[PDB]
Amino acid sequence: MKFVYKEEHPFEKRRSEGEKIRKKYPDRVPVIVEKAPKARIGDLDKKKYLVPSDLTVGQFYFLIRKRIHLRAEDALFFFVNNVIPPTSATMGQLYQEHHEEDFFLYIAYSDE
């Protein structure tokens, strides 16, 4: 899978952005959200989020879903490194387990 954020930005640029956040905001995590490639679902206009680390994955889903051009009944699923996260996990927990070398957490969403 290929996040467009990674095509649009050099690693060293992304790492500087992610590392600054981690060192200056202990209560926040830098998150990229993009549609999974094969996904068949409405579009999200913004991809770069600064996310309270103590939000649960379920709470993050609620806030993100509001921003996706969706049909009212559409559900979506999050994948982090190809795994659907638990909803009771927090974004800080996911970040510790799954952040990439540029220090971002990447979430792909899909209609699945």
């Binding site: 930005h9 640029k13 952005e17 830098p30 913004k46 770069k48 989020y49 600064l50 996310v51 309270p52 939000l55 709470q59 609620f62 806030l63 509001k66």
Partner: peptide, 15 residues
């Protein structure tokens, strides 16, 4: 360069 979306205005609806 790319701006951050912060969700600050959103947290109110979680309370």
């Amino acid at each position: 360069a790319e701006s951050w979306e912060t969700l600050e205005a959103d947290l109110i609806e979680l309370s």
